Amino acid sequence: DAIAIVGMSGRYPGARNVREYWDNLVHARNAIRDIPTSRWDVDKYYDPVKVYCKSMGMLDDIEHFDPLFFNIPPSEAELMDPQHRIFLQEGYKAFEDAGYNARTLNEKKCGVYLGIMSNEYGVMLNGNSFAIAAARIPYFLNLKGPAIPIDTASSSSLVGTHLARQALINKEIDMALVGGVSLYLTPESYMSMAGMLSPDGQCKAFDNGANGFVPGEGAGALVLKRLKDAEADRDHIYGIIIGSGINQDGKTNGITAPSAKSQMDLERDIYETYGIHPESISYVEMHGTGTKQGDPIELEALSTVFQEKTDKKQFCAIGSVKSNIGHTSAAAGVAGVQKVLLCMNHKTLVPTLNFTTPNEHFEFEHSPLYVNTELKPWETADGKPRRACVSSFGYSGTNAHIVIEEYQPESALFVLSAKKEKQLKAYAEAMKDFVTSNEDIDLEDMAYTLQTGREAMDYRMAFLADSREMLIKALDDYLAEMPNGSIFAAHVKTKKSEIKLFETDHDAKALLQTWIEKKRLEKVAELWVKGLQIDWNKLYGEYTPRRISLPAYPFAEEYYWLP
């Protein structure tokens, strides 16, 4: 039936994580910049009549990777497509977002469905196949569901979502990691203009000035489970997928042109199959690429389908994050899904950009649809969960559309760890920022997530806190190296002898067990940082807190490029 989204991670232009993404959306920020000479010299390719677009939504630090984290030799990292490297990182972080770690993922039947559509690095070099890109995560984490790359161009990551959903519903897998990654490394690729790109370097989605898209870069991942499992497992749930479908354009006027009729059939068939009335939908993240003949076709299709079922007018807001970040290609679907989930979580709609005058080939006034350009509350009537759709159409003519529904659910000991001390310090910084930004964080849920939803790695710190202010101060003291008697820290490999007593003696174990049961947190903390395995479940009696989303591992930022 319903598929829960239980974890997410993303990296988009202007946004290193989904928190910065949300902040950028709320503030109507546009991330598109001129391409710098550190990528390639646009002057050497630019002609106005060659490339006619000089702009891109670009990711920062595409060369950065933490190969040692993944048991990969540094020299092999230079030979790996950065698409692979960046997805490996984001995919891993999505699992940590959900509160799953290597131990809890080991041997899981988790499918991996990866949207990917380009091979620039591998060519520049003359390991880098799409097959291997999709398999890196399963190899690392010892997953056992199928690992399949999907290249249906810009619908890839939504196609992958559809396949994962079907596999989950058929019980062939028990979890999925779905995602997409796109980079534009070369003037040659990004180039293919084919007439596709905007000379102004903006996706003017829905606007009469729409004249092509601006390429964008990105990487994102979602972790999916059947809703009944997610509820039994006490996952945190961002939203639910309640319908999806894929089809083809078939014969169009040129193989890259869209089909109104296919888009209508796709949407109608989904809504009929899954019993979804268009009146119940209040937002659609459109494919919305800002192409002159594409945009009106999309609007007219969707509008027509909605109007078959209702006479209600201007009840469904439409937008496209491509107006913020550009066209992120194989990652486009996952970027749109994330935007929708964030909007649902905060009960807020955010502006779509670059919209001055409606496209002349479509009349909005008598449409179910309207273009939302305002930051505003996402209102819903009565009890009802919010619902939204996401569309993603590819140049090869394979289309996808999904429907998402809002999910409506019925002293603490803080521990942190990393593979290197420098990354522990970066972790503490990330947590301090997060807590600073999130004044309402539930401290007991946060601690419980750090205890049970993160792997205990070799460099450790821990401390007690009963409030946000105390928590912030401990992290500050840790970072400033300023003495604080409630902060503990150690490198596990250095403390083996100091812990052995509690691992082998029967009365020591019984005293440790008693300590954990009577919540003697200072004692548990000192021993944990030294490497002692703590049975965290024993800390909790009648009441067990819940896993929540927290910042995920701060990878080492080591540069690797062509050998």
Binding site for a copy of itself (CB under 8 A): 107, 109, 112, 117, 119, 123, 126, 129-132, 134-136, 138-153, 156, 159, 163, 166-167, 170, 172, 188, 245-252, 255, 262, 265, 394-399
E strand segments, 268-397: 283-285, 316-319, 348-349, 369-371, 376-377, 387-393
Query: Whose Cβ is closer to a copy of itself: residue 101's or residue 398's?
Result: 398
Please give the Cα distance from 468 to 474 (Å, whole number): 10
Both tokens assigned to 463? 């401390």
Rounded to an integer, what is the distance from CA 466 to the centroid of its chain?
31
Q: Please state the closest distance from residue 392 (CB atom) to a copy of itself, in A.
A: 12
DSSP states of 491-510: EGGG-HHHHHHHHH-HHHHH
Q: Which of 199, 164, 205, 137 is nearest to 3 (CA)?
A: 164
Q: Please state the closest distance from residue 195 (CB atom) to a copy of itself, in A.
A: 14
Query: Whose Cβ is closer to a copy of itself: residue 21's or residue 87's?
Result: 87
Both tokens assigned to 255? 């193989």
Please give the Cα distance from 386 to 402 (Å, whole number): 14
User: Terminal CA-to-CA distance of the chain, rounded, Å?
Assistant: 49
Query: Whose Cβ is closer to a copy of itself: residue 31's or residue 167's?
Result: 167
One-letter amino acid identity for 398?
T
Quick check: 205 and 295 in contact, CB under 8 A?
yes
Both tokens assigned to 381? 């009537």
Please give the Cα distance from 417 to 434 (Å, whole number): 17
Reduce the DSSP state of residue 532 to 3 states and report it: coil
Reduce the DSSP state of residue 511 to 3 states and report it: helix
Query: Whose Cβ is closer to a copy of itself: residue 179's or residue 531's?
Result: 179
Q: Please state the closest distance from residue 265 (CB atom) to a copy of itself, in A.
A: 7
Q: Please state the closest distance from residue 22 (CB atom) to a copy of itself, in A.
A: 31
Q: Please state the closest distance from residue 162 (CB atom) to a copy of itself, in A.
A: 8
Burial class of residue 419 (count of CB atoms within 10 Å of its CB; 0-12, 13-18, 19+): middle
Task: Tell me how many degrees the CA angle 11-189-119 measures, rounded to the nearest 5.
Answer: 70
Query: Whose Cβ is closer to a copy of itself: residue 92's or residue 427's?
Result: 92
Instruction: Sheet with 487-491: list strands edge to edge.
Output: 412-418, 459-465, 487-491
Q: Please state the closest distance from residue 152 (CB atom) to a copy of itself, in A.
A: 5
Query: Whose Cβ is closer to a copy of itself: residue 144's or residue 346's?
Result: 144
Please give the Cα distance from 465 to 197 (Å, whole number): 53
Q: Please state the closest distance from residue 3 (CB atom) to a copy of itself, in A.
A: 14
DSSP states of 196-208: -B-TTS---TTBT
Burial class of residue 526 (count of CB atoms within 10 Å of its CB; 0-12, 13-18, 19+): middle
Q: Please state the closest distance from residue 32 (CB atom) to a copy of itself, in A.
A: 24
Task: Tell me how many degrees the CA angle 407-441-12 measures, rounded to the nearest 5.
Answer: 65
Query: Whose Cβ is closer to a copy of itself: residue 183's or residue 450's?
Result: 183
Query: Whose Cβ is closer to a copy of itself: residue 130's or residue 306's?
Result: 130
Please give the Cα distance from 356 to 204 (Å, whole number): 9
Query: Whose Cβ is closer to a copy of itself: residue 46's or residue 140's?
Result: 140
Residue identified by tokens 């994050």 is: 321
Strand partners of residue 376: 349
Q: Please state the closest distance from residue 223 (CB atom) to a copy of itself, in A.
A: 16
One-letter amino acid identity for 121?
Y
Query: Whose Cβ is closer to a copy of itself: residue 202's or residue 262's?
Result: 262
Q: Please state the closest distance from residue 246 (CB atom) to a copy of itself, in A.
A: 4
Query: Whose Cβ is closer to a copy of itself: residue 37's or residue 273's?
Result: 273
Q: Please state the closest distance from residue 142 (CB atom) to a copy of itself, in A.
A: 4
- Residue 36's contacts (CB-CB under 8 Å, 6 or more residues apart) are none
